[PDB]
Design a protein around this nucleic acid. Sequence first.
DNA 1: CGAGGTAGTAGGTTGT
DNA 2: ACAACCTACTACCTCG
DNA 3: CGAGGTAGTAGGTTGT
DNA 4: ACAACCTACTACCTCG
Lengths: 638, 673
Amino acid sequence: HLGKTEVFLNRFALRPLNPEELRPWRLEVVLDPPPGREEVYPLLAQVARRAGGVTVRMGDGLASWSPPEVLVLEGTLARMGQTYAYRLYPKGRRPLDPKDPGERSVLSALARRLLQERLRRLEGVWVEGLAVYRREHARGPGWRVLGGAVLDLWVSDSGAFLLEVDPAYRILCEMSLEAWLAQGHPLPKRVRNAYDRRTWELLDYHASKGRLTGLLVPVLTLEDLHEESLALSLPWEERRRRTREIASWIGRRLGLGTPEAVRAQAYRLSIPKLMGRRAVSKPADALRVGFYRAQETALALLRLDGAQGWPEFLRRALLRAFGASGASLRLHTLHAHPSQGLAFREALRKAKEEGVQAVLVLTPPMAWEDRNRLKALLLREGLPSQILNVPLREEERHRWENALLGLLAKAGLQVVALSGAYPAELAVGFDAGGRESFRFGGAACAVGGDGGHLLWTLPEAQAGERIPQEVVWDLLEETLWAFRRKAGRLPSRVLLLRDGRVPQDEFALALEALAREGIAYDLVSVRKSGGGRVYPVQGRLADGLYVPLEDKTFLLLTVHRDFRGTPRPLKLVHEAGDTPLEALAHQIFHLTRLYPASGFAFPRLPAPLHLADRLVKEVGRLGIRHLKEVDREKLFFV
Amino acid sequence: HLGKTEVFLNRFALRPLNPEELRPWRLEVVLDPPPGREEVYPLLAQVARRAGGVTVRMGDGLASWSPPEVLVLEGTLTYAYRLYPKGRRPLDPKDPGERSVLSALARRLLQERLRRLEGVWVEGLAVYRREHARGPGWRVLGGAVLDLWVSDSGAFLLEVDPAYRILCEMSLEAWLAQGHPLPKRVRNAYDRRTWELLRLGEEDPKELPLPGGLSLLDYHASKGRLQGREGGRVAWVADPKDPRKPIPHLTGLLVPVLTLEDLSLALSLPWEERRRRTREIASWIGRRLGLGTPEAVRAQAYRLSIPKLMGRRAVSKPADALRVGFYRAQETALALLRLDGAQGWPEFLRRALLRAFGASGASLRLHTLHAHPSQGLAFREALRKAKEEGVQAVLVLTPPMAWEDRNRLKALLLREGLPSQILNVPLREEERHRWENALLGLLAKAGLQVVALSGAYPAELAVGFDAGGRESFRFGGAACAVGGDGGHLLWTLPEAQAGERIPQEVVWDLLEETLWAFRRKAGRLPSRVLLLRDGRVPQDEFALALEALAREGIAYDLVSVRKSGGGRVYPVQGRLADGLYVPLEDKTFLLLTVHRDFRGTPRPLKLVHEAGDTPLEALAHQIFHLTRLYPASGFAFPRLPAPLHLADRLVKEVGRLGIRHLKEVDREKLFFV
DNA sequence: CGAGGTAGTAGGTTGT
DNA sequence: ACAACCTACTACCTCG
DNA sequence: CGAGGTAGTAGGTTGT
DNA sequence: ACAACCTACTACCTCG
Ligand SMILES: [Mg+2]
Ligand SMILES: [Mg+2]
Ligand SMILES: [Mg+2]
Ligand SMILES: [Mg+2]
Ligand SMILES: [Mg+2]
Ligand SMILES: [Mg+2]
């Protein structure tokens, strides 16, 4: 729309497949005893590896770039205690057409195993799977950091090796955990063994094993090396040069040749139009300019630092904000403490009885247990809450404004909105999350084309990442109803955003329900990884980049700051619907600017998805049982 | 303090253990390979069985009632085992640990000496000895379930309870070769794994691509499964651990798992019948095993006071409140939704409600929802308006629905804050019990207190906890009766959890909500709360909650309420009646809460007072009386005290419908009954 | 708990 | 088993 | 979906 | 493994 430009992907064209490689050998797999219908795939994958060479599962049997005579055609196989005896039978050679994508897939699996194999046969280089660390970045008392790249290798439809590369660093420890704290570093929150890779959370016995304290090795993180301060984010120009360097080094050293940089047509997307009361360039400006929509609100202060009132500068800033919005503000103070037990809960009930909408909490940094308990208790009285750490100087503007912003989203005000005009006037995001054996499936939405309302819905408990079909529809029905309650009508079109892959048929019911109500839709999968890197052929790297790729599949570079490192574009698939890709790309990129609780940095994900993700993250942390009396317009979880 | 009486338990006293038994033999175990620390206690269990004799696990090794020299001391199962005599260890039955091992021995002795009999069908600690009923292909056997352990006087105790067993003696092919329909469940003829049967398939066994390459027939044949059988026809069965994959199988390799639905034959016994039958079998067992003549054990039982149910006047059952008036009626509005295409309230339902509310001096408005679900969202809008006009609960007249549609409808109405009561619609006025219950359910769902107790209890707040739901995660939930009279029933939003254990913060939070409702209703904190747990109280589950109650100055009692494990109770003389309190140890007692002659032999609840200073008699009194508060069953009282029965029904429905619907539903409205 | 992404360190689910 | 995605955490740097 | 317990059938979690 | 508890289904029979 705003400029047809051109970019380099972090892929590289390498040599064509030789006519052998285009004609892999085929072996059929014979097992004794034959495996149960649930152990097939993990077993074929195993035989494929045991046979050695460059071999991959191809259907119900195997395909290899190695002639069968230099393969381990007979052997045995251990899985979950059971023992299977395999034998491979060569069945001639099937040529594969790289154009046909079915056949291209298997060629690409071969390609991947080749790279992995030829990587082993190198030195003196640290390799783990398809990653290789060919240099040293940093060292110290018992630790070193290696530099290298994670690689991948497949086959293009023109029949050539494509090679994906991305510079990466690796943290390696050189001491026993005793030998580690032979110098002053505390207990790492994770420890690994040198006798197995099986780590955990952290005298008679270990005797007979011939294996407590000198047997393991610490799993080193950045928290363990804060005290030593080098960083491992690369500026995008350095990352691109080191990408090319490494893509050539692998070209020769593995005999694949000259790395031809891969190029793609990108498009510059129109700039989004953020509005407070008037136009702003960042959500924090709404504190000076005024909010997009603002009603009469009452905030209350809760101090845990033993201090007395509203900090004056917070008070003024607040009146300035509400002054510019021409909305009436009243500031309350909770004169109570969580240590009074239920007396506290009474105090909260009365605050809310008197119109308080959210609570600002000044406190020293809290233990998560106390932090969580506090939040959850205020939630049970219908009060969302924003915490602001209490050694606080006015000079720390970015910290308190962001708190202020969060507090207001929590009280239910729309601080900013978009002023364009879009194909969908309801955009809803779905994530799953939660740090247990079950998860919460959940959803948040922007209602109105301007994004003039942000609501969450009560999540639902679920076994895995898949959201049950009726759940997907129900949460979606709640967002339509929110639209109905604000616009007095149904939306003509809904933009449905799912975090990650859309598991097979997950939205079948919902889509069918939309048709019946005559609501158009677009389902888009939004992938946070798998997009790779994008570099400008010439000039500078900027946001709003849209890269069409396959059909119904595109990259989208939504955020970039030339101080955070190389950005990582989202990868998006249009799963259902008939809106032109460019239009989805436009609306999603704009939705990225709608987030109210970050004053100075837009989120990589569009607002509905980012909110959804925070929502399920918080429910999973506090529990769902607290949320009955909390208004959906109040974004409690930001 | 009401008067005592004596009962017979279904236990029996047998002979004292002899000098030899009190001093079992100890053997240490060597295994090659060594056991992987997680897989070692099941292993010692295996060696103990393969050793032979009466031999069990005892901590690190084994204890035997056979001398080592007549045990299979060396063998293959970790695979190779060898056992080493390490002398004999005296055991003191007064020591609960040592008693625990004597008892493990006794069970093994029982199973072993049961094995050596003939001709009697034996499964674990059960024995079937006669033939109740048969049919071409199937037979139901009649025997009893037993257990045997050691008292602390050092003598055997036999427990006996009559039981029937349903057996299929035919393959699924031979079964269907009789005319018998499709058994809803089936089992492999080669292992104990069972499948849900979906249908038959036209397909050919010879040619059916099983994942991997094999077909159906060769796959089973390559395992020797058809060695001695016939493949039969293609069967389609269902995921044990998924929900998007029917699976091919072979009729000739399958056996039906027979249930009542697959067959005129009541298997419940009238209490006097079970009583004698128990005594026969006990005298028979004790004779055959050379354990002496069984003296049935007797226990002191105490009869509790008849609970006084209060409608607006006193009643003997909740349904009478429909004639006499409710405990506490408010101005209420109900709407009608007809899925039968008919219109208006059946006059007899209109009358009954009018009679009930007139007796209660409270006004009633009846609405009709002129909307239907197949309108889609316009139907939600109709609901939203109805809530807006004050409708509190909706009666739904409909043909028997499928669970999917039932569930969706109840959830939708829930999303507009409207509890519903379904009443199936071929409905004659003379079906008084069904529609009166429906009416009782409707009113509860609208938030009325239909009945309440009059009496004096230690706790003026009683809360029940349970976990349920049918997945890899469950809901931990709580329901409660507030006030001495329990004239306020409430639920709380349940919380998802991994298994049976409710997290400590959850327990407290749920408990806090019920304190909060008490505060809202009574203007103060409660003086004492009665905490009822369904099943056992997992170690420390209430630690945090109890600590919190203490800090707030609220007294408490924790009681574990166990639906099984309490055995049977019979009168020494006279008819058997409920309201029986039978203390066993300090802090543990039996409680017969409900019984009806026509409803077979009652199973009393087993209770354990886990914390609190309240006397057992008192707890028993309140718990027994709490059993009578339940408003949605007009003609028979639930076995559980109302707070737990409510909690159980709560978490069932939340599991069934999902918690996402509950946000706008008032906690006074008992939507799940 | 200020927030954002990019970096690193773990790990888990979907599904062929 | 393994590809191709997701979850959680801390440190770094700067403030569309 | 009428409700209750006791029957039968299947399965599971908690703790040693 | 095993002991001692829990969940779900449906048949039966009657209506504190
Ligand atoms: Mg996700
Ligand atoms: Mg997430
Ligand atoms: Mg926040
Ligand atoms: Mg339970
Ligand atoms: Mg239950
Ligand atoms: Mg009901």
